[PDB]
Coordinates of C-alpha atoms and ligand atoms in Angstrom, one line a residue:
Chain A
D23 CA 0.0 0.0 0.0
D24 CA 2.6 2.6 1.3
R25 CA 4.8 2.6 -1.8
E26 CA 1.9 2.2 -4.3
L27 CA 0.2 5.2 -2.7
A28 CA 3.4 7.3 -2.8
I29 CA 3.9 6.5 -6.5
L30 CA 0.2 7.6 -7.2
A31 CA 0.6 10.8 -5.2
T32 CA 3.9 11.6 -6.9
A33 CA 2.3 11.0 -10.3
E34 CA -0.7 13.3 -9.5
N35 CA 1.6 16.0 -8.3
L36 CA 3.9 15.9 -11.4
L37 CA 0.9 15.9 -13.8
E38 CA 0.0 19.4 -12.4
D39 CA 3.3 20.6 -14.1
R40 CA 3.8 18.5 -17.3
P41 CA 2.2 15.9 -19.5
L42 CA 2.8 12.1 -18.8
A43 CA 5.2 12.0 -21.8
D44 CA 7.5 14.5 -20.0
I45 CA 7.4 12.5 -16.7
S46 CA 10.0 9.6 -16.4
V47 CA 9.8 6.4 -14.3
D48 CA 12.9 7.8 -12.5
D49 CA 10.9 11.0 -11.5
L50 CA 8.1 8.7 -10.1
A51 CA 10.5 6.3 -8.3
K52 CA 12.5 9.3 -6.9
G53 CA 9.3 11.1 -5.7
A54 CA 8.1 7.8 -4.1
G55 CA 11.5 7.2 -2.5
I56 CA 12.1 3.8 -4.2
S57 CA 14.4 2.6 -6.9
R58 CA 13.5 2.3 -10.6
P59 CA 13.4 -1.6 -10.5
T60 CA 11.3 -1.4 -7.3
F61 CA 8.8 0.8 -9.3
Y62 CA 8.5 -1.9 -11.9
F63 CA 7.4 -4.2 -9.1
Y64 CA 4.2 -2.1 -8.4
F65 CA 3.5 -0.9 -12.1
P66 CA 4.7 -2.0 -15.6
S67 CA 4.7 1.6 -17.0
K68 CA 3.9 5.3 -16.2
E69 CA 0.8 4.6 -18.4
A70 CA -0.3 2.0 -15.8
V71 CA 0.1 4.6 -13.0
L72 CA -2.3 7.0 -14.9
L73 CA -4.9 4.3 -15.5
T74 CA -4.9 3.6 -11.7
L75 CA -5.2 7.4 -10.9
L76 CA -8.1 7.7 -13.4
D77 CA -9.8 4.6 -12.0
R78 CA -9.6 6.2 -8.5
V79 CA -11.1 9.6 -9.6
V80 CA -13.9 7.9 -11.7
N81 CA -14.8 5.6 -8.8
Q82 CA -14.9 8.5 -6.4
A83 CA -17.4 10.3 -8.7
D84 CA -19.4 7.1 -9.2
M85 CA -19.5 6.4 -5.4
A86 CA -20.7 10.0 -4.7
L87 CA -23.4 9.7 -7.4
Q88 CA -24.5 6.4 -5.9
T89 CA -24.8 8.1 -2.5
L90 CA -27.0 10.8 -4.0
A91 CA -29.0 8.4 -6.2
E92 CA -30.1 6.2 -3.2
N93 CA -31.1 9.1 -1.0
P94 CA -34.6 10.7 -1.3
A95 CA -35.3 12.8 -4.5
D96 CA -34.9 16.6 -4.0
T97 CA -38.5 17.9 -4.4
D98 CA -37.1 21.0 -6.3
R99 CA -36.3 19.5 -9.8
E100 CA -33.7 22.1 -10.8
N101 CA -31.8 21.5 -7.4
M102 CA -32.0 17.7 -7.9
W103 CA -30.2 17.9 -11.3
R104 CA -27.8 20.6 -10.1
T105 CA -26.6 18.5 -7.1
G106 CA -25.9 15.5 -9.4
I107 CA -24.1 17.5 -12.1
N108 CA -22.1 19.2 -9.2
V109 CA -20.7 15.7 -8.2
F110 CA -18.9 15.6 -11.6
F111 CA -17.9 19.3 -11.4
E112 CA -16.4 19.0 -7.9
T113 CA -14.9 15.5 -8.3
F114 CA -13.2 16.1 -11.7
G115 CA -12.5 19.7 -10.8
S116 CA -10.6 18.6 -7.7
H117 CA -8.4 16.3 -9.9
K118 CA -7.8 18.5 -13.0
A119 CA -4.3 17.2 -13.8
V120 CA -5.5 13.5 -13.8
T121 CA -8.7 14.6 -15.7
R122 CA -6.6 16.3 -18.4
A123 CA -4.1 13.4 -18.7
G124 CA -6.8 10.7 -18.7
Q125 CA -8.8 12.4 -21.4
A126 CA -5.6 12.7 -23.5
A127 CA -4.8 8.9 -22.9
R128 CA -8.2 7.8 -24.3
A129 CA -6.6 8.1 -27.8
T130 CA -3.6 5.9 -26.9
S131 CA -4.9 3.5 -24.2
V132 CA -7.7 0.9 -24.9
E133 CA -8.0 0.4 -21.1
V134 CA -8.4 4.2 -20.5
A135 CA -11.0 4.4 -23.4
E136 CA -12.8 1.3 -21.9
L137 CA -12.8 2.7 -18.4
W138 CA -14.2 6.1 -19.5
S139 CA -16.8 4.4 -21.8
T140 CA -18.1 2.0 -19.0
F141 CA -18.6 4.8 -16.6
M142 CA -20.2 7.1 -19.2
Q143 CA -22.7 4.3 -20.1
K144 CA -23.6 3.8 -16.4
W145 CA -24.2 7.6 -15.9
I146 CA -26.2 7.9 -19.1
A147 CA -28.3 4.9 -18.1
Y148 CA -28.9 6.4 -14.7
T149 CA -29.8 9.8 -16.2
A150 CA -32.3 8.1 -18.6
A151 CA -33.9 6.1 -15.7
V152 CA -34.5 9.4 -13.7
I153 CA -35.9 11.1 -16.9
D154 CA -38.3 8.1 -17.4
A155 CA -39.4 8.2 -13.7
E156 CA -40.1 12.0 -14.1
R157 CA -42.2 11.3 -17.1
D158 CA -44.1 8.5 -15.3
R159 CA -44.8 10.9 -12.3
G160 CA -46.2 13.4 -14.9
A161 CA -43.4 15.9 -14.0
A162 CA -41.7 15.8 -17.4
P163 CA -43.3 15.6 -20.9
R164 CA -42.8 12.6 -23.3
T165 CA -40.6 14.3 -25.9
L166 CA -37.3 12.6 -27.1
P167 CA -36.3 9.0 -26.3
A168 CA -34.9 9.4 -22.7
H169 CA -31.7 7.4 -23.5
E170 CA -30.8 9.5 -26.5
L171 CA -31.5 12.8 -24.6
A172 CA -29.4 11.4 -21.7
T173 CA -26.6 10.6 -24.0
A174 CA -26.3 14.1 -25.6
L175 CA -26.6 15.8 -22.2
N176 CA -23.9 13.6 -20.6
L177 CA -21.6 14.2 -23.7
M178 CA -22.3 17.9 -23.4
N179 CA -21.1 17.8 -19.8
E180 CA -18.0 15.7 -20.7
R181 CA -16.9 18.2 -23.3
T182 CA -17.9 21.4 -21.6
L183 CA -16.5 20.5 -18.1
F184 CA -13.2 19.3 -19.7
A185 CA -12.9 22.5 -21.8
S186 CA -13.6 24.7 -18.7
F187 CA -11.1 22.8 -16.5
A188 CA -8.4 23.0 -19.2
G189 CA -9.2 26.7 -19.9
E190 CA -9.6 25.9 -23.6
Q191 CA -10.6 28.5 -26.2
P192 CA -13.6 28.2 -26.6
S193 CA -14.8 27.3 -23.1
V194 CA -17.5 28.4 -20.5
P195 CA -15.6 30.0 -17.6
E196 CA -15.4 27.5 -14.7
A197 CA -17.4 29.9 -12.4
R198 CA -20.3 29.8 -14.9
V199 CA -20.2 26.2 -16.2
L200 CA -22.5 24.5 -13.5
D201 CA -25.3 27.1 -14.0
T202 CA -24.9 26.8 -17.8
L203 CA -25.2 22.9 -17.8
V204 CA -28.1 22.9 -15.3
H205 CA -30.1 25.3 -17.4
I206 CA -29.7 23.2 -20.5
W207 CA -30.5 19.9 -18.6
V208 CA -33.6 21.4 -16.9
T209 CA -35.0 23.1 -20.1
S210 CA -34.4 20.0 -22.3
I211 CA -35.9 17.5 -19.8
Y212 CA -39.0 19.6 -18.7
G213 CA -39.5 21.7 -21.9
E214 CA -42.5 20.8 -24.0
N215 CA -42.4 20.0 -27.8
Chain B
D23 CA -3.2 22.2 -58.7
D24 CA -3.5 18.7 -60.5
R25 CA -0.9 17.0 -58.3
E26 CA -1.8 18.8 -55.1
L27 CA -5.5 17.7 -55.6
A28 CA -4.5 14.1 -56.3
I29 CA -2.4 14.0 -53.1
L30 CA -5.4 15.3 -51.1
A31 CA -7.9 12.9 -52.7
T32 CA -5.5 10.0 -52.1
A33 CA -5.1 11.0 -48.4
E34 CA -8.9 11.3 -47.9
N35 CA -9.4 7.8 -49.5
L36 CA -6.7 6.1 -47.4
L37 CA -8.0 7.7 -44.1
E38 CA -11.3 5.8 -44.7
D39 CA -9.2 2.5 -44.1
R40 CA -6.5 3.5 -41.5
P41 CA -5.2 6.2 -39.3
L42 CA -2.6 8.8 -40.5
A43 CA 0.2 7.0 -38.5
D44 CA -0.5 3.9 -40.7
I45 CA -0.3 5.9 -44.0
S46 CA 3.2 6.5 -45.5
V47 CA 4.4 9.3 -47.8
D48 CA 5.1 6.5 -50.4
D49 CA 1.3 5.5 -50.2
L50 CA 0.3 9.2 -50.9
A51 CA 3.0 9.7 -53.6
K52 CA 2.0 6.3 -55.2
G53 CA -1.7 7.1 -55.1
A54 CA -1.1 10.6 -56.6
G55 CA 1.2 9.1 -59.3
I56 CA 4.3 11.1 -58.4
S57 CA 7.6 10.3 -56.7
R58 CA 8.4 10.7 -53.0
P59 CA 10.7 13.7 -53.5
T60 CA 8.0 15.3 -55.8
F61 CA 5.5 14.9 -52.8
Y62 CA 7.9 16.9 -50.6
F63 CA 7.6 19.7 -53.1
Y64 CA 3.8 20.1 -52.5
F65 CA 3.8 19.2 -48.7
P66 CA 6.5 18.9 -45.9
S67 CA 4.7 15.9 -44.1
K68 CA 1.6 13.7 -44.2
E69 CA 0.6 15.9 -41.2
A70 CA 0.5 18.9 -43.5
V71 CA -1.8 17.0 -45.9
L72 CA -4.3 16.4 -43.1
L73 CA -4.2 20.1 -42.1
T74 CA -5.1 21.1 -45.7
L75 CA -7.9 18.4 -45.9
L76 CA -9.3 19.7 -42.5
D77 CA -9.0 23.3 -43.7
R78 CA -11.1 22.5 -46.8
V79 CA -13.9 20.6 -44.8
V80 CA -14.1 23.4 -42.1
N81 CA -14.2 26.2 -44.8
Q82 CA -17.0 24.2 -46.7
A83 CA -19.1 24.2 -43.5
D84 CA -18.3 27.8 -42.8
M85 CA -19.2 28.9 -46.4
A86 CA -22.5 26.9 -46.2
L87 CA -23.4 28.5 -42.8
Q88 CA -22.5 32.0 -44.3
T89 CA -25.0 31.2 -47.2
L90 CA -27.7 30.4 -44.7
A91 CA -26.9 33.2 -42.2
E92 CA -27.2 36.0 -44.9
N93 CA -30.5 34.6 -46.3
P94 CA -33.9 35.5 -44.7
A95 CA -34.6 34.0 -41.2
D96 CA -36.9 30.9 -41.4
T97 CA -40.1 32.1 -39.6
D98 CA -40.4 28.6 -37.9
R99 CA -37.8 28.9 -35.1
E100 CA -37.2 25.1 -34.7
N101 CA -36.7 24.8 -38.5
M102 CA -34.3 27.8 -38.5
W103 CA -32.0 26.0 -35.9
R104 CA -32.4 22.6 -37.5
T105 CA -31.3 23.9 -41.0
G106 CA -28.1 25.4 -39.4
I107 CA -27.2 22.4 -37.3
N108 CA -27.8 20.2 -40.4
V109 CA -24.9 22.1 -42.2
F110 CA -22.5 20.6 -39.7
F111 CA -24.2 17.2 -39.7
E112 CA -24.1 16.9 -43.5
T113 CA -20.7 18.6 -44.0
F114 CA -18.7 16.7 -41.4
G115 CA -20.9 13.6 -42.0
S116 CA -19.8 13.6 -45.7
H117 CA -16.1 13.7 -44.6
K118 CA -16.1 11.3 -41.6
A119 CA -12.5 10.0 -42.2
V120 CA -11.1 13.6 -42.3
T121 CA -13.3 14.5 -39.3
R122 CA -12.0 11.6 -37.2
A123 CA -8.3 12.2 -38.2
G124 CA -8.6 15.9 -37.7
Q125 CA -10.2 15.6 -34.2
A126 CA -7.3 13.1 -33.3
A127 CA -4.7 15.6 -34.6
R128 CA -5.9 18.4 -32.3
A129 CA -3.8 16.7 -29.5
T130 CA -0.5 16.6 -31.6
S131 CA -0.8 19.7 -34.0
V132 CA -1.0 23.3 -32.7
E133 CA -2.1 24.3 -36.3
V134 CA -5.0 21.7 -36.2
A135 CA -6.0 22.8 -32.6
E136 CA -5.8 26.6 -33.8
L137 CA -7.9 26.0 -36.9
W138 CA -10.6 24.1 -35.0
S139 CA -10.6 26.7 -32.2
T140 CA -10.9 29.7 -34.7
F141 CA -13.9 28.2 -36.4
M142 CA -15.6 27.1 -33.1
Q143 CA -15.2 30.7 -31.8
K144 CA -16.8 32.1 -35.0
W145 CA -19.8 29.6 -34.9
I146 CA -20.3 30.3 -31.1
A147 CA -20.2 34.0 -31.8
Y148 CA -22.8 33.7 -34.6
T149 CA -25.0 31.4 -32.4
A150 CA -24.9 34.0 -29.6
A151 CA -25.7 36.8 -32.0
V152 CA -28.9 34.9 -33.2
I153 CA -29.9 34.2 -29.6
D154 CA -29.5 37.9 -28.8
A155 CA -31.6 38.9 -31.8
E156 CA -34.3 36.4 -30.8
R157 CA -34.4 38.0 -27.3
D158 CA -34.5 41.6 -28.7
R159 CA -37.5 40.4 -30.9
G160 CA -39.2 39.1 -27.8
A161 CA -39.1 35.5 -29.3
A162 CA -36.7 34.1 -26.6
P163 CA -36.5 34.8 -22.8
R164 CA -33.6 36.6 -21.2
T165 CA -32.2 33.6 -19.3
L166 CA -28.5 32.6 -19.4
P167 CA -25.8 34.8 -21.0
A168 CA -26.2 34.2 -24.7
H169 CA -22.4 33.6 -25.3
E170 CA -22.1 31.0 -22.5
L171 CA -25.3 29.2 -23.7
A172 CA -23.9 29.2 -27.3
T173 CA -20.6 27.8 -26.1
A174 CA -22.1 24.8 -24.3
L175 CA -24.6 24.0 -27.2
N176 CA -21.8 24.2 -29.8
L177 CA -19.5 22.0 -27.6
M178 CA -22.4 19.5 -27.2
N179 CA -22.7 19.4 -31.0
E180 CA -18.9 18.9 -31.5
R181 CA -18.8 16.0 -29.0
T182 CA -22.2 14.4 -29.9
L183 CA -21.7 14.6 -33.8
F184 CA -18.1 13.2 -33.5
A185 CA -19.3 10.3 -31.3
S186 CA -22.1 9.5 -33.7
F187 CA -19.9 9.6 -36.8
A188 CA -17.2 7.4 -35.1
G189 CA -19.9 5.0 -33.7
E190 CA -18.4 5.5 -30.2
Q191 CA -19.9 3.8 -27.2
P192 CA -21.7 5.8 -25.9
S193 CA -23.2 7.7 -28.9
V194 CA -26.6 8.8 -30.2
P195 CA -27.3 6.8 -33.4
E196 CA -26.5 8.9 -36.5
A197 CA -30.2 8.7 -37.7
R198 CA -31.3 10.3 -34.3
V199 CA -28.5 12.8 -33.7
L200 CA -30.0 15.8 -35.6
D201 CA -33.4 15.6 -33.9
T202 CA -31.7 15.1 -30.5
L203 CA -29.5 18.2 -30.9
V204 CA -32.3 20.4 -32.3
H205 CA -34.6 19.5 -29.3
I206 CA -31.9 20.5 -26.8
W207 CA -31.0 23.8 -28.7
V208 CA -34.7 24.8 -29.1
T209 CA -35.8 24.0 -25.5
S210 CA -32.6 25.7 -24.0
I211 CA -32.9 28.9 -26.1
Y212 CA -36.7 29.4 -25.9
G213 CA -37.4 27.7 -22.5
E214 CA -38.3 30.0 -19.5
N215 CA -36.4 30.1 -16.1
Ligands
JPH1 C1 -34.0 6.7 -8.5 C2 -34.2 8.0 -8.3 C3 -35.2 8.7 -8.9 C4 -35.3 10.1 -8.6 O1 -36.3 10.7 -9.2 N1 -34.4 10.7 -7.8 C5 -33.4 10.0 -7.2 C6 -32.5 10.6 -6.3 C7 -32.2 12.0 -6.8 N2 -30.9 11.9 -7.5 C8 -30.6 12.5 -8.7 C9 -29.3 12.2 -9.0 C10 -28.7 12.6 -10.1 C11 -29.1 13.8 -10.6 C12 -28.5 14.3 -11.7 C13 -27.5 13.5 -12.4 C14 -27.1 12.3 -11.9 C15 -27.7 11.8 -10.7 O2 -26.1 11.6 -12.5 C16 -25.7 12.1 -13.8 C17 -25.6 13.6 -13.8 O3 -26.9 14.0 -13.5 N3 -28.8 11.4 -8.0 N4 -29.8 11.2 -7.1 N5 -33.3 8.6 -7.4
JPH2 C1 -28.5 37.4 -38.6 C2 -29.6 36.5 -38.6 C3 -30.5 36.5 -37.6 C4 -31.6 35.6 -37.6 O1 -32.5 35.6 -36.8 N1 -31.6 34.6 -38.7 C5 -30.6 34.7 -39.7 C6 -30.7 33.7 -40.7 C7 -31.1 32.4 -40.2 N2 -30.0 31.6 -39.9 C8 -29.8 30.8 -38.9 C9 -28.6 30.2 -39.1 C10 -28.0 29.3 -38.2 C11 -28.9 28.6 -37.4 C12 -28.3 27.7 -36.5 C13 -27.0 27.5 -36.3 C14 -26.1 28.3 -37.1 C15 -26.6 29.2 -38.0 O2 -24.7 28.2 -36.9 C16 -24.3 27.4 -35.7 C17 -25.2 26.1 -35.6 O3 -26.5 26.6 -35.4 N3 -28.0 30.6 -40.2 N4 -28.9 31.4 -40.7 N5 -29.6 35.6 -39.6

């Protein structure tokens, strides 16, 4: 545990300053206070270290959403969506360097792409289930297929949060992105036609 | 012109089968019926060939949007947005291999990233201008800042169209993506609160 956790913490700290390609196994070993061959005991590559960091951040979001999902529904519909979107905002926003490196790795790592895809499918399925339950309650109109609406809104959040965190041009400023996403989710879920 | 256009057509044809990394200068030269050194006359790298292909596709979309933007406004608001989103759907959807390769290159090419960023900023600015004009006409409510709403909706379209064209998991099916995006644009622009 001890040495594994030091490698992960070292990697998260160095990713704040430079991309994974500019971080060496020696940097990771040195920061974790172990030798290079001892590193190779705990991980095969710096790529494996990033996969584990991303797995931890994604599971932290998923666990926080599970906590919310299994509590009573907020009776204010806008606040119910805002609290859930905020789990992603705070969780990924608290790990920007891992977020940035992980989104980059989706192009070069089938494991990173698979991890991201699995969790997106879960979050989309859960979004769709809540939309469906809102329609059954008569709170939301029967407009688009709930699963297709959930997919586009989750993909919006993926792209828009990422752009905000990375300060891309174009991007919504980070202090405006939650309100912007909640508006679009609430109008598109509750909006007639 | 002749030999430049053959190189571009060869490159677009080969990108339908394999990524740029798996295409050689010899493949491009051979398909364009020229020698390797003659290729280097027209382009420094296969990376430069992709930049030119992406520039052509992006300018084709931009010219088609300009054509629409300077014609009279469709008096049906849903149809006005649908026709504009459809320019991106048809244009990028007609050049999926260049779209896929270009989005991949944004990570490795500052020129590709700059080209994509410039055009996204233009399209977001134009979206925001139309929202603002709808609010001035009393057709749309004064909700979110128009430029922030435009940014999230354009980023949604970037991510969602890309995912559909690439058949990513998750994705909206290509036959459903236009209706899905138009619903979200129209409810979020015209929707009160
Ligand atoms: C089964 C059930 C029905 C119901 O109507 N309310 C709940 C609990 C309320 N709730 C909502 C969420 C939630 C809200 C927004 C989200 C989200 C989760 O994940 C993806 C991003 O958007 N988590 N818990 N549970
Ligand atoms: C200045 C003016 C005001 C007005 O209200 N109507 C027009 C013309 C109508 N129009 C709309 C668009 C259009 C619609 C949707 C779009 C889009 C363009 O680009 C980004 C994707 O979404 N192009 N032309 N012109």
